[PDB]
Amino acid sequence: SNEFWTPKRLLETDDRIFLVVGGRGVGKTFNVTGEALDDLFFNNVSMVYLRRLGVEIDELEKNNFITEEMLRVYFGNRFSDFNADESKQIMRFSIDGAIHEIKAIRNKIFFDDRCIVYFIALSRAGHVKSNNYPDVKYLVFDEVIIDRSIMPNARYIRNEFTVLLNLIETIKRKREDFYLFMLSNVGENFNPIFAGLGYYLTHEDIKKGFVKREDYCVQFVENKQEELNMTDPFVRLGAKNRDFSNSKTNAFENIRTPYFKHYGKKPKLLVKYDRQYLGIAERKIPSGLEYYYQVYKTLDGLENITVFNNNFDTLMEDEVFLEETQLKKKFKTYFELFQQNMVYHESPETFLEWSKFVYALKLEHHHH
Amino acid sequence: SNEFWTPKRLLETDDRIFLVVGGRGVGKTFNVTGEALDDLFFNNVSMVYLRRLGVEIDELEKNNFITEEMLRVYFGNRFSDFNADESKQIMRFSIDGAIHEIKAIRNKIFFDDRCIVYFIALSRAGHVKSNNYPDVKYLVFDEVIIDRSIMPNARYIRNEFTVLLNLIETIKRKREDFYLFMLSNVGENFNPIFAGLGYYLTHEDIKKGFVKREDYCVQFVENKQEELNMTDPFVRLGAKNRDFSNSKTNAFENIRTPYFKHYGKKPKLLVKYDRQYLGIAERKIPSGLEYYYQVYKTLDGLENITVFNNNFDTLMEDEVFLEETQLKKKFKTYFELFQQNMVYHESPETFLEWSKFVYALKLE
Amino acid sequence: SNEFWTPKRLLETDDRIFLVVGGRGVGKTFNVTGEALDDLFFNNVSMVYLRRLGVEIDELEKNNFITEEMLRVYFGNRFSDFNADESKQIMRFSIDGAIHEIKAIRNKIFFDDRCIVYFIALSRAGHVKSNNYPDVKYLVFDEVIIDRSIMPNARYIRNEFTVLLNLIETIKRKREDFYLFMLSNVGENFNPIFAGLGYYLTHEDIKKGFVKREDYCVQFVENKQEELNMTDPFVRLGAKNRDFSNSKTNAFENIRTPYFKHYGKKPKLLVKYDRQYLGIAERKIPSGLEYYYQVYKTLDGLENITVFNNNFDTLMEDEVFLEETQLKKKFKTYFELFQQNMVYHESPETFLEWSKFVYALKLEHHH
Amino acid sequence: SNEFWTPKRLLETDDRIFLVVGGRGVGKTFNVTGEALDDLFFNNVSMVYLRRLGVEIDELEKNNFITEEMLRVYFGNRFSDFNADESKQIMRFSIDGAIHEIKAIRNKIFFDDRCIVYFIALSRAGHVKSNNYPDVKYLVFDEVIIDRSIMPNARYIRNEFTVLLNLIETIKRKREDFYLFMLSNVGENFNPIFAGLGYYLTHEDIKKGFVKREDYCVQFVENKQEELNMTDPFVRLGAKNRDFSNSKTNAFENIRTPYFKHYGKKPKLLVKYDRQYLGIAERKIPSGLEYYYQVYKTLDGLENITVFNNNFDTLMEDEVFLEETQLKKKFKTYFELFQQNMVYHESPETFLEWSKFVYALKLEHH
Amino acid sequence: SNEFWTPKRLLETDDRIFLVVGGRGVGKTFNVTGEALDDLFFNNVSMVYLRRLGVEIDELEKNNFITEEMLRVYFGNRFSDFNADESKQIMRFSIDGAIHEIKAIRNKIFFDDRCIVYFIALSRAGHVKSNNYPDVKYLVFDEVIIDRSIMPNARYIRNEFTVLLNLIETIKRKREDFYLFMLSNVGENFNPIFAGLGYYLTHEDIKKGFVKREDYCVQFVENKQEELNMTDPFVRLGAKNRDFSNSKTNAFENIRTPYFKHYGKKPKLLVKYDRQYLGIAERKIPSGLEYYYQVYKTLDGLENITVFNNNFDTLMEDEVFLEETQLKKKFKTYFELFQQNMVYHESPETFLEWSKFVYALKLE
């Protein structure tokens, strides 16, 4: 009867950055979008719908982004008779006895001849920042985490999290009131979005529906297990095929938690990042080698470890500059080892710091 | 038209899921559609026409999906004068003295400005939200089994039957009254659709027109070879070309029956699927190897056989997770061996269980 | 000119299937279309314009299919003032003092809000047969034989003739009055269309303008030698360039006649097709091998030669089934030898029987 | 005298085919178009603007093809007040006290709701109906010769000149009053257009402003040196970059002159083309071989030299049939040697005849 | 807050070529565009917005190129009530009591049915020069220098500066009053634009906000350190990610200064460019070779060293022509060595001369 998930709890807290994970088919996009229409229609505000890849937007049904059922549930009795024409891709409806119309053209949705929704893709939006969106209060990131099942080969954009942040500034031109919604159908570690936020996924946090951080709040949406009527043939048929049943809870199936271990010796190499020094230490073992990733706040006790510097300004003394060509030779193999859970991190905090560094420089990795 | 086959017998039985096989050119889709207009017009209900490949829908002439002949035979004495305009894809007709219009625009057909028929393709079925299709009582899947002659290379969607079920669930939002029609011009084993239903095609079931199961009914429609008027040149020309003539009776030409043999020895590997354990056992022979595919209800007697688990959550203890990248290597040859009839299956029931597993994970 | 060729002679004979070859620029498409308008306009009948490849239809000018010059020549004095609007793809004209309008949208042409012409492509026609073209009296297959000059690489559909035959049956359901027009700018052997008809192209048949078979008629159009006004500079320039001049007579340049020889020995393999047995025999010669393609009506004297069966139902006993993966292994090299004029055929009738078999099972080109 | 080029001199001669080369920035297209309007407006005549590649037309601004300035210079005081609407591409002006409007929509420009200018691309030329163009008196081919600078990689259409001739015949239907204009910003040998015309570019012809041939006239337009005002900052900045300055006189920089030498010995192979026999003769030299391309009218003295025939119909007697797929292997290396200036040609007449043969069958594959 | 940068100072000086570097987020394009409207509306003048790649223009929002705020800040009280319709991209407003409308369709913006702004891409600009813009006073090049971080793969157009210069002459035909603006978010050496202008970037010039050349003036805008509101979550998040924070001051982070050294010995090869001869000299060293790029005013003392000449017309006698195939064999490796700072340059002036040569003939 009532929509399972609502964005209200997230809106009530002070934080303005919300991350919603799991519960695909629950209409997260339906409810997040649904809440805003109240604002978009009469507060002279617009919304930007963000997708990672430009291909995803072209396939998206823009005529159905705002649907009659959506208007009817959020406005209810206030919503009047609705007489849309699908050939012309125009919707006419009346609210409060006042006529309004929605028409979807190109990548924009128009309400009473005013643009309320912008459809832009991160792969294309990043390439031009001269664009300017005058009034935007809501940015929504849908399917923000890659799902291997839906898409066999999908690669996160290069230095993705930084590209997104720069896009925020262009969309949000020093606006006090701005909201960001990130919606993921599946949640797992080792993505750049988690690295940027700094959130580390753990089963305990999954058990607790709500987790609180300083900058953002992440809420976990789990679709209630419903007694399935076995008199219905379609329900029985879905039950016989297990691959169908398992799809519902696949979101939190695997979180890709990484290994943790402590190693006393000093790293083979150091790289200075974020007023910090990252080091990798190798321990020789009979079968091969064992790799340990560490973070050092200071260089005390590490006189002779070579230091690589990514940034030109911060370089000083003997540290060697790190160029695009150089970082591949030294760190290509180390990055591949990082992506897979083949390495030991001293603590979860160090894993986040390393994630920020790795996902900034990750590139290509196609057929390698 | 509707003379040979009617869906009325299927509607008369209790089951709500129907599989119709064979009898191409008999207007199966015409009559399933034909019966439903009765509801679509006046019971405030709609229908969805489902095709596997988006190409099948784009090329389909949607304005003629509902034709005057159809309207006239199903409404009969009620049907009045009919004045259609083809340019705007509008039909004007009166039933019971009430004027109505059917307009087809884009992938939807409207009856009195209400959508009664939706045209959607299974390849695109993903990213279709339930709000787009409010009221649907009928889903019709046409040409559900691949035909080798019509299309040279056509591949069932990866994990297709699961894709279909999600489409069922999205379209049918806990609706008690829902009907599924699966219409196939040709019937043969080794497709995912038969596997999903759990139906195994056999000549005995083909001779008996109707087979009932717990969830569905499958009815086989075969048109008897009709005397061809040899005065018409087009008919005369078709007779001279044999590949065309054999196409008429192509539906049940080959049912792809698979080999069956039993091997006592224990399997080489185990993979846990569907609350069960599937194993492949190899018997060495002078020329090479002989393959036996088995199903184990339980692990009794199989202490140390390695177990691969498709699902991460259910995995436990010594079972090693099987991810898609690591999976290809192990089961590539076994999947090739399954698709080509090169392995021995213990029984048809195990063959069906293996079909579910294979077609869920198949990749070309 | 438009008055050069007329389909009238073809219509006068009883046969309903016509194959027109050669004479590029003679307006075969213009006149075949021209004859029908009387029917399309006033007999509540429609026409289907069929092309092999979807590329041919998308590039085709939908608006210019029916032109003012066309309407005027076939209707003449009956044709009234003509006031077309080029922007919106609309034509308004009056016939017998009655106003009519022709509009072209997407792949259809409409006359008085009724669809008279359908544009559909054979490559896409196979995917869907449930479509309903309600009333069709005319089906036109244009540029039915591939010309390498116009199109460097063009591939016939796999099992093409059956795709076409299925399309005939889908378009023409229950119609006593139906006409098929096949129009080729160039005529040559070794195409699947000729194989399906059973017609074998020969220089003698080209000399006689008209040939009659049981099912169809083939008429050969050769453009009469025309006096070239030298005085015109553009005419003088075209003469200097031979590739331009040779294009005019390109239709019958090469008819791809195949070699014929008889070999007594029995074949290496047999394949059963059309209640007959086709065989290939190899004769070893010092330089290499010599291939002979034969047809046997019966198995008498061929006890132990292996027999391949294309169709599963008819297969029996010692015959080994021929699957798609199998025929490529056995017959890929033999099919290559057939396409290139490298084998000896016993007679033209066996060549046709072999052509039907090859083009039914032919491998899809690599790409 | 008159620093501004006009097509009047070209129009005065009898010939109807004109090739204009060089002088980029002189407004060749501006004046060729400009001269015709009197006919287009009041003689019920249309013009066709032809470009090799569709890309050139799509980027082209069709509205400004006919501009107010163009109208004023040719019509002058006779031209009245002009109040055009740029949004809808509708211009408003009166001539001789009669109001007129020119509206540009899609690939056509309409004058008083009548089409006077057609914009069509040679790449897209296929499947255009002759009837579509009832009356066309002017065909203008702009940038007809490829310029290496404008486009890093640019390819002439396969068998282009034959493609052009088919398009000429379709547009023109025994029209006595028909004109062909070919405007090229750069002139050089070894293109199919020169091969088709039969024109061989030579510096003497460039020094002589005007050249007449049987079918056409070629006029060379050279823009005078204009003392460049240094006061403009843009001009001084251009001076520092030399690659920019040389572009103005780039047209006649390189004419691709081919080597000429005569060789007495008889050829190695013969191929029959155009009722003629082409031959390639090789002279052995210490470093390698020397190639001489010759043309023979008759086979006298050439008894046993093999003859290849491209066309099956004309084939006869001892000639061995050569098919398009087989033809390339035999002549691939010889064709490569022709395109790069590495062979000796008997005369310019033979060089053109070889060009016609090569450009008809030259093909690239991968 | 307040526009950190305004174009008025640049407009005040005589020179007509301005190069603006750095200060991302300052609305350089916002203020340059804003200043011109006074001219575009009432001086019967137009403007051309230049982007390197056509991809950059298609993604650009033509309706938001001119925004109500920009209108409001530059005209202020003069601006009246504004009620635009975004559906058709038509704005209506009144200035000085006179009603006007600007409608943006395709790649053009029209003011009172007159085109004031043209959107063209440099990659496509070459192929069509016949296009004639009757009145153009402003040409603006935005993001003129490539930024490696924002765009993964970005190529300077081959011979870009000449392509731009040819475009200048076509757009500006005999116009005395013309202004060119070049706005770059990042400033670094080794781009063709700096080479074409002849400006050599140096940190000393970065400290001084304004640098004056003869042909042009270049102004450097660095966005002053502003206290970041740490109540805003987005600002708090950016501080944690260092790569994001550096982006604002990334412009002048690295200028790619090249090494400079003089070598007396004569070069291996000479290439004549701009009535001068560039030479590369190799000194054999144990690890490998050391490359020195030099400029010679005359050939005295270099009688027999090979000379490559780029232009055929100027080529004469012993000079060897430099063709597309020939320039790949000799100079492919030398160009790779130039792009990376692996070579020694005699002076900064010679480096610019080598830059003119390299970026004119470089191929990717």
Numbering used by the authors:
A (entry chain D): 5 to 372
B (entry chain E), E (entry chain C): 5 to 368
C (entry chain A): 5 to 371
D (entry chain B): 5 to 370
Sentences from the paper on this structure:
Two crystal forms of gp11 were obtained: (i) tetragonal crystals belonging to space group P43212 and (ii) trigonal crystals belonging to space group P3221. While the three structures described here were determined in the absence of nucleotide, the active sites of ASCE ATPases are well characterized and can be accurately identified. Two distinct conformations of the Walker A motif are apparent in our crystal structures. One conformation binds either a SO42− or PO43− ion in the canonical β-phosphate position. The ion forms hydrogen bonds with the backbone of the Walker A motif in lieu of a β-phosphate, typically provided by ATP or ADP, which explains why the Walker A backbone adopts a conformation similar to a typical nucleotide-bound ATPase configuration. However, because the structure was solved in absence of nucleotide or nucleotide analog, it lacks any interactions mediated by the α- and γ-phosphates, ribose sugar, or adenosine base. Thus, this structure likely represents a conformation with mixed characteristics from both the apo and nucleotide-bound configurations. However, the crystal structure of asccφ28 gp11 ring reported here shows no such helicity in the N- or C-terminal domains. We suspect that we do not observe helicity in the crystal structures due to lack of substrate DNA imparting helicity.
